[PDB]
Amino acid sequence: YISRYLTDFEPIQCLGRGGVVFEAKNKVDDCNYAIKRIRLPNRELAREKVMREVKALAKLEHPGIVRYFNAWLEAPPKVYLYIQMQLCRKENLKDWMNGRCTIEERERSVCLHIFLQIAEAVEFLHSKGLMHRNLKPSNIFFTMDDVVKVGDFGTKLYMSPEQIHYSHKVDIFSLGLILFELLYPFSTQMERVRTLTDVRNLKFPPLFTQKYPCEYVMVQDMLSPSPMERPEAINIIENAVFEDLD
Ligand SMILES: Cc1nc(N)c2c(-c3ccc4c(c3)CCN4C(=O)Cc3cc(F)cc(C(F)(F)F)c3)cn(C)c2n1
């Protein structure tokens, strides 16, 4: 038996655990790619649902969506689906925040620029009738050219309550926390978990509300306990704060 993957690629390392993501070099074209390997479900209608997904997702092109290349099936001696995506930077949004722990390092322009890219990506999906469902700093990447991409789709800190215990409004909740986290640097993991757990419950640090009153009202709208009351992604983009950005 000849495996497409082993034939065409030289594996480099593992990138994601699970649904597994490898880094591999294509032999013909000499580029490195992120390759996700999914073990397909064994029942037919479960597979058919997954295959209908790759078909819808294949049509996706956007500056905030990671670039797609190829999708194929293998059945060695049960069945694996392989997905070839562009390889992003080693350091993700979580890595980025961790190396920048002072408010001087969290420039208001840079952070709103990063956030806007994520929001624009989510608006894109929502208009196609899709949703991400998996937004979080560790699953937000930069390209070799520092363009922000939302990560894999299709820790529960960034999950909306109705996700844990439901519509596209789940993505809106996730955005809320990311916006907060971007503007509010942390010193320790301990602090981070405590503060973020409190923010989910609308208990904001005073210094934040003092410094970013505009963004504060936005985060409140995005973190509404009633999903109905949360804004759409388009409303977030069409907000006053996203004007005159250099
Ligand atoms: C350095 C680096 N780069 C990555 N691209 C990744 C990825 C990664 C990012 C995005 C996506 C994946 C892995 C698998 C699926 N994927 C997606 O964005 C969904 C997607 C988008 C499409 F446009 C098309 C498809 C599909 F057609 F189904 F293949 C899927 C995960 N990890 C850990 C990564 N690490």
Measured by CA distance, the residue closest to atom 2 of ligand 1 is: 88
130 Cβ closer than 6 Å to some ligand 1 atom: no
Atom of ligand 1 nearest to the CA of 56: 27
Give the number of other Cβ atoms within 10 Å of residue 212's Cβ. Answer: 19
| Distance in angstroms (rounded) separating the CA atoms of residues 84 and 180 | 33
How many angstroms is the resolution? Answer: 2.7
Sequence ranges of the domains in the chain: 1-87, 88-246
Closest CA to 57 of 42, 38, 76, 74: 38
H or E element at residue 24: strand 20-26
Domain at 88-246: CATH architecture: Orthogonal Bundle (1.10)
| Distance in angstroms (rounded) separating the CA atoms of residues 143 and 91 | 10
Q: Which CATH number fits domain 1-87: 3.30.200.20, 3.40.50.300, 3.50.50.60, 3.40.50.720?
A: 3.30.200.20
Would you give the end-to-end CA distance of the chain in angstroms? 56
Helices and strands in the chain: count of H runs, count of E runs: 10, 7
Measured by CA distance, the residue closest to atom 31 of ligand 1 is: 152
For 170, counting Cβ atoms within 10 Å of its Cβ (0-12 exposed, 13-18 middle, 19+ buried), the class is buried
- Note every long-range contact of 197-206, with CB atoms under 8 Å and residues 24 or more positions apart, other chains counting: 197/157, 199/223, 200/157, 200/161
58 Cβ closer than 6 Å to some ligand 1 atom: yes
142 Cβ closer than 6 Å to some ligand 1 atom: no
21 Cβ closer than 6 Å to some ligand 1 atom: yes
20 Cβ closer than 6 Å to some ligand 1 atom: no
The DSSP code sequence of 71-97 is: EEEE-----EEEEEEE---SS-HHHHH
Closest CA to 74 of 44, 42, 37, 45: 37
DSSP letter at 11 equals E
Residue 129 CA to ligand 1 centre (angstroms): 19
Write the CB contacts of 52 (distance below 8 Å, at least 6 apart in sequence).
none
Residue 231 CA to ligand 1 centre (angstroms): 27
| Distance in angstroms (rounded) separating the CA atoms of residues 185 and 211 | 13
8 A C-beta contact, residue 209 and residue 77:
no
- Note every long-range contact of 156-159, with CB atoms under 8 Å and residues 24 or more positions apart, other chains counting: 157/193, 157/196, 157/197, 157/200
For 78, counting Cβ atoms within 10 Å of its Cβ (0-12 exposed, 13-18 middle, 19+ buried), the class is exposed
Per-residue b or e along 123-149, where b marks 16 or more CB atoms closer than 10 Å to that residue's CB: bbbbeeebbbbbbbbebbbbeeeeebb
